[PDB]
C-alpha cells in the first residue's frame, strides 16, 4: 500500500498487538510494520529514517529485503556487517535496488541482532502485471495479505535468550493466555469469490501449521517462485517463508476459524489463542465456532514443484556440481557452529573487506565462517540436522538466491528433475539432511544462515563470498553507503 518509492521512519513506542502494552518498533509510526509494494521489473528507493531512542531494542538499524535477488546491488541488501554498517540514530540511509525477474511475496525487517523480533518486519508484495495464474483468482490486495509472527511480552534483550512467545499475531494481532479477550484478526471474503492470500511469516522463532476450517488451499508460489498449483488442507510455514494460495470461498456463509498452531509455546487454540476469522461477507460479527478436521492432505514441500518444472543445476546425481559443501552443525559455549565456526560479526563488514582488498575466504573475518564460491557455477549445500544443534528444525536462509531444494525434510528422496525452488529451507530433524542447490550467478557475499533470530544471534551462520574478484566491479556503492561505517564507529556503545 506503500513504494516502490517510499520513506520508513523507523521510531520506537508502545504497541498492544495482543491487548497487553510494551514498547517496541514502529515504522512509520504504526505496528504491525505497513505493507510495501511494487510491481515486476520496478526500481524500490526506500529511505530508511533511523529515530530509534531506545538502546535496549538498539537504536541502529539495517534493513533485508527478503526473497530479492540484489544483483550489482548487494550493498543494499541489509545483513549487518556482512552487507553494510548499521544505520545510526538520527540517520537515514537510501535502499535503491531493481527487482528484475522476480514477482511474488516477499517480507522485510531488521537485519540487525534479534532487532526484527521487537517489531521492525513488514510483508512486501511484488505483483506480476502477466502473472501465470492471475486466472485463477478474483481478489489479490492489500487485504489477501496474511502475516504470521510470534510476540513477546519481554523484548529479545530483556527476556530469557530463547523465549518462549506470548502470543502468535495474525495481520498483527491475537491473544494470549491473560488477554482471551484481546481483538482478532478478521479477514473477510465474499460467497463466489476466489482469493489469492498471501501468506508470510515474520517469525522470529516458531513455525506454524496453518489451515482454515472448511476450506482447502491451492498452493500457487512458495517463497517468490511460481508452483504449479497444488491443493493441501494444512501447510506448515517456517520462519522467513512466503506461500501464496487460491482460496475459493465457495463454503456457506460463515465464520470459519483461521489456525496457526506453533510448533512451541501455546500449542492448542483455547480461547481463539493462535487463531483469526476468515468471515464471509453476511455473517455475524462473532468468533467461529468451527470445528478442526484432520489434515489428511498436508503440504509435503518434495511434492511441490515449479510452474516450468525447473530442473536443479547441475547434473543428477549427489556431487554433481562445480562445488559442493557440507555443513556440519554444533553448538557450545552457548553458541551455534557450522563446520567448528560460530558467526561473531565482523568490525568491518564482509562487503567492505572485499572492497577494501581481501581475496579470499581465509582473509575475510570472521575466520573460519566465510566460504569462497566459484563464478558462474553449480553449487551444492547440505545441511544434516543433529541433536547437536538443539531448537531443530532449523529454518536456513540463502541471501542473494533462490535455490533447488534436491531433497526436503522427513524425505528419504533427492528430487534433481524437478524439485521445488525457494529460499527458506526447514533442514528438519536429526537423520534428515536437507540438500539444496543453487548457481553462482550473483557476485558477492551472501548471508546462508538460520532465520530464528534467536540462532543467528547465537553464531549459527555462515557468508558465502561468492565470486570475490567480480564483487567490487559487479557493485558499485553509493556514497551514503560508505559513510554509513565511519558514522557508526564513531557511536558511544549506549548509543548503538
Ligand atoms: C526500551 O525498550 C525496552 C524493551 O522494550 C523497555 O523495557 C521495559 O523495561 C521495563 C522497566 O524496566 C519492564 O518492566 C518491561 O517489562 C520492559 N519491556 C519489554 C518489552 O521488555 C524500556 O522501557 C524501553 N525504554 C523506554 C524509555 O521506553
Ligand atoms: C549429508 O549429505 C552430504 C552430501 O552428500 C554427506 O557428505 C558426503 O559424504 C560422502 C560419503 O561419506 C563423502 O564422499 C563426501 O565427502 C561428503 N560430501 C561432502 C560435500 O562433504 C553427509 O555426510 C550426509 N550426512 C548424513 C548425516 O547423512
Ligand atoms: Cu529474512
Ligand atoms: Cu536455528
Ligand atoms: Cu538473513
Same mark, same amino acid.
Request: glycine letters at 18%; proline letters at 9%.
Given at each position: 500500500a506503500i513504494g516502490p518509492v517510499a520513506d520508513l521512519t523507523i521510531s520506537n513506542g508502545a504497541v498492544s498487538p495482543d491487548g497487553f502494552s510494551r514498547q517496541a518498533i514502529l515504522v512509520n509510526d504504526v505496528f504491525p510494520s505497513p505493507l510495501i509494494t511494487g510491481n515486476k521489473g520496478d526500481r524500490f528507493q526506500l529511505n530508511v529514517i533511523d529515530n530509534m531512542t531506545n538502546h535496549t531494542m538498539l537504536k541502529s538499524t539495517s534493513i533485508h529485503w527478503h526473497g530479492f535477488f540484489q544483483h550489482g546491488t548487494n550493498w543494499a541488501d541489509g545483513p549487518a556487517f556482512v552487507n553494510q554498517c548499521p544505520i545510526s540514530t538520527g540517520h537515514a540511509f537510501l535502499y535503491d535496488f531493481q527487482v528484475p525477474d522476480q514477482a511474488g511475496t516477499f517480507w522485510y525487517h531488521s537485519h540487525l541482532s534479534t532487532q526484527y523480533c521487537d517489531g521492525l518486519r513488514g510483508p512486501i508484495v511484488v505483483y506480476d502485471p502477466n502473472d501465470p495464474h492471475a486466472s485463477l483468482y478474483d481478489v489479490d490486495d492489500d487485504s489477501t495479505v496474511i502475516t504470521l509472527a510470534d510476540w513477546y511480552h519481554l523484548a529479545a534483550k530483556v527476556g530469557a535468550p530463547v523465549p518462549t512467545a506470548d502470543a502468535t499475531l495474525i495481520n498483527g494481532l491475537g491473544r494470549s493466555a491473560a488477554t482471551l479477550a484481546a481483538d482478532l484478526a478478521v479477514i473477510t471474503v465474499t460467497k463466489g469469490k476466489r482469493y489469492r492470500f498471501r501468506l508470510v511469516s515474520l517469525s522470529c522463532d516458531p513455525n506454524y501449521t496453518f489451515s482454515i476450517d472448511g476450506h482447502s488451499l491451492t498452493v500457487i508460489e512458495a517463497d517468490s517462485v511460481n508452483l504449479k498449483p497444488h491443493t493441501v488442507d494444512s501447510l506448515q510455514i517456517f520462519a522467513a517463508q512466503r506461500y501464496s494460495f487460491v482460496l475459493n470461498a465457495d463454503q456457506d456463509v460463515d465464520n470459519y476459524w483461521i489456525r496457526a498452531l506453533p510448533?512451541?509455546?501455546?500449542?492448542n487454540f483455547a480461547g481463539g489463542t493462535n487463531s483469526a476469522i476468515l468471515r464471509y461477507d453476511g455473517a455475524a460479527p462473532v468468533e467461529p465456532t468451527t470445528s478442526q478436521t484432520p489434515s489428511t492432505n498436508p503440504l509435503v514441500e518434495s511434492a511441490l514443484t515449479t510452474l516450468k518444472g525447473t530442473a536443479a543445476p547441475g547434473s543428477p546425481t549427489p556431487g554433481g556440481v562445480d562445488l559442493a559443501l557440507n555443513m556440519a552443525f554444533g553448538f557450545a559455549g552457548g553458541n551455534f557452529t557450522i563446520n567448528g565456526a560460530s558467526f561473531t560479526p565482523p568490525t568491518v563488514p564482509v562487503l567492505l573487506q572485499i572492497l577494501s582488498g581481501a581475496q579470499s575466504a581465509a582473509d575475510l573475518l570472521p575466520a573460519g565462517s566465510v566460504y569462497s564460491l566459484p563464478a558462474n557455477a553449480d553449487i551444492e549445500i547440505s545441511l544434516p540436522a543433529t *541433536? *547437536? *544443534?538443539?531448537?531443530?528444525p532449523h529454518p536456513f536462509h540463502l541471501h542473494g538466491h533462490v535455490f533447488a531444494v534436491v531433497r526436503s525434510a522427513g524425505s528419504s528422496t533427492y528430487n534433481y528433475a524437478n524439485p521445488v525452488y525457494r529460499d527458506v529451507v526447514s533442514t528438519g530433524a536429526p537423520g534428515d539432511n536437507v540438500t539444496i542447490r543453487f548457481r553462482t550467478d550473483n557476485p558477492g557475499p551472501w548471508f546462508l544462515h538460520c532465520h530464528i533470530d534467536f540462532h543467528l544471534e547465537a553464531g549459527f551462520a555462515v557468508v558465502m563470498a561468492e565470486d570475490i574478484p567480480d564483487v567490487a566491479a559487479t557493485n558499485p556503492v553509493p556514497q551514503a553507503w560508505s559513510d554509513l561505517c565511519p558514522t557508526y564507529d564513531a557511536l558511544s556503545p549506549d548509543d548503538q
Open positions: 510448533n512451541s509455546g501455546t500449542q *541433536a *547437536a *544443534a538443539p531448537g531443530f
